[PDB]
T-cell receptor, first 200, second 241 residues
Framework: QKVTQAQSSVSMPVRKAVTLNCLYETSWWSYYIFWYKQLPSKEMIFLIRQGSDEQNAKSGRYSVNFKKAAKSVALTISALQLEDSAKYFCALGVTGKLTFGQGTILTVHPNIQNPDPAVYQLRDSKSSDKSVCLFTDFDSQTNVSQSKDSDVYITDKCVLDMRSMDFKSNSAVAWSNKSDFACANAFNNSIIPEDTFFPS | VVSQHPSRVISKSGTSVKIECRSLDFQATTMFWYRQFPKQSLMLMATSNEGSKATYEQGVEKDKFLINHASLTLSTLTVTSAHPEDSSFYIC?????????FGQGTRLTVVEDLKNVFPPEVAVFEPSEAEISHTQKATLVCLATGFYPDHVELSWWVNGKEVHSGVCTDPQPLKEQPALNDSRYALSSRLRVSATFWQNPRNHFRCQVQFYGLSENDEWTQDRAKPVTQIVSAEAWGRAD
């Protein structure tokens, strides 16, 4: 048995729909496909089950596009909410025993009508030797690349608190204790808008 | 519901680590044991069965992992001669329902020595004046660094009340040295408020980082403070200038 979730991460704004792909391989004639979401606690939450001999599954906001010949069983989540940000797993179940995919991390983003991408230099903390750069107000589809220097740390884009109801914004941070570290070049490994603001 | 015990455990290498899977309000003659290494899939290890021998999956050493069906409501998994390579997430399940009933899992951390356990260092960074001028908004940054194991919970507290608006946190902790097996971790979060709220010297901002560490019963010989389960915070007052 094999379950393939080729996408490691996907970003989509609130109120939109998102499709998470899953491909499987099985020699069995009768089986089930399950979709679970794994919460930050690492708890597994049931979303939907697709039977090998059934029509397209539906449960709450979840639906499955079951392409049996293609052994494709994509999950669509409709009307996305901030609480939907989690890691989603596709699993193939034969006699209770499950085979899982690698999982796909879905980040649900706020609707940013007026992106204002910018990189800000923060004041040094009198309690830390770390210099911090904040990349903020960029749009959902911005990809933040990892550092290519062991002495420079760069986070991915953050996940908004699911109960947030204000000052909603996408951001990443970069920090270092290197003498030469500057915010002007900290996020160079990323492809960013030509109008990103870099204040002096 | 299926309940696992313990939820978390930090064990010394060479010890026997027992993990329990209990079916509450129902009986299970069969229980499944899964293992998940970080950023990897859940993999079936073994199947516990009432009145018969445990079934083991390919590559699972029967000598290293003892599976036992103790009763019609209990299945146990024993990590014999625990090694740091055994550090993983162990989750059990029992048949029943559309899916299966899953336990909440066990975060097993195996350390060569309890001195490999480090709490987070927590720092707060104040809003940039350039951000305030450009957007009339003010973002605080919290950094939690050098902790091991990678399990922390970060929250923001304004004037002694937890806040959720304007809060955005890293999906997962960052491996400080990705190429090192003994790497420590870091995590960041942001809190955005209006510049008017930030510029009030009466407002209090605190980033709280809960860390799961050593138990009260655990041995400690180092000069540094015993890294027990604790809260590490960083704070700042509003700034009128």
């Amino acid at each position: 048995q094999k379950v393939t979730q080729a996408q490691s991460s996907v970003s989509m704004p609130v109120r939109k729909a998102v499709t998470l792909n899953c491909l499987y391989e099985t020699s069995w004639w009768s089986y089930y496909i399950f979709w679970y979401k794994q919460l930050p606690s690492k708890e597994m939450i049931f979303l939907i089950r697709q039977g090998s001999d059934e029509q397209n599954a539906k449960s709450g906001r979840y639906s499955v596009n079951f392409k049996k010949a293609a052994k494709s069983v994509a999950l669509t989540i409709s009307a996305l909410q901030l609480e939907d940000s989690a890691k989603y797993f596709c699993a193939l179940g034969v006699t209770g025993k499950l085979t899982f995919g690698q999982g796909t991390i879905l980040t649900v983003h706020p609707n940013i009508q007026n992106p204002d991408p910018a990189v800000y230099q923060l004041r040094d903390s009198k309690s830390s030797d770390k210099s911090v750069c904040l990349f903020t107000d960029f749009d959902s589809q911005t990809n933040v690349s990892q550092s290519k220097d062991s002495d420079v740390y760069i986070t991915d884009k953050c996940v908004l608190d699911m109960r947030s109801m204000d000052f909603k914004s996408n951001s990443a941070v970069a920090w270092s204790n290197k003498s030469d570290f500057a915010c002007a070049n900290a996020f160079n490994n990323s492809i960013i808008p030509e109008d990103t603001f870099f204040p002096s | 519901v299926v309940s696992q015990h313990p939820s978390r455990v930090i064990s010394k290498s060479g010890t026997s680590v027992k993990i329990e899977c209990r079916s509450l309000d129902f009986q299970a003659t069969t229980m499944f044991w899964y293992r998940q290494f970080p950023k990897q899939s859940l993999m079936l290890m073994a199947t516990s069965n009432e009145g018969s021998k445990a079934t083991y999956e390919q590559g699972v050493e029967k000598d290293k992992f003892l599976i036992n069906h103790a009763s019609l409501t209990l299945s146990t998994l024993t990590v014999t001669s625990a090694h740091p390579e055994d550090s993983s997430f162990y989750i059990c399940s029992a048949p029943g329902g559309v899916g299966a009933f899953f336990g909440q899992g066990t975060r097993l951390t195996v350390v060569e020595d309890l001195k490999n356990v480090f709490p987070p260092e927590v720092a707060v960074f104040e809003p940039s004046e350039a951000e305030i001028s450009h957007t009339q908004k003010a973002t605080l940054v919290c950094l939690a660094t050098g902790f091991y194991p990678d399990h922390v919970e970060l929250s923001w507290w304004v004037n002694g009340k937890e806040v959720h608006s304007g809060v955005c946190t890293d999906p997962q902790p960052l491996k400080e040295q990705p190429a090192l097996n003994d790497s420590r971790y870091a995590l960041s979060s942001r809190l955005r408020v209006s510049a008017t709220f930030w510029q009030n010297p009466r407002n209090h901002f605190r980033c709280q980082v809960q860390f799961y560490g050593l138990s009260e019963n655990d041995e400690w010989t180092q000069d540094r403070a015993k890294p027990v389960t604790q809260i590490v915070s960083a704070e700042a007052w509003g700034r009128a200038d």
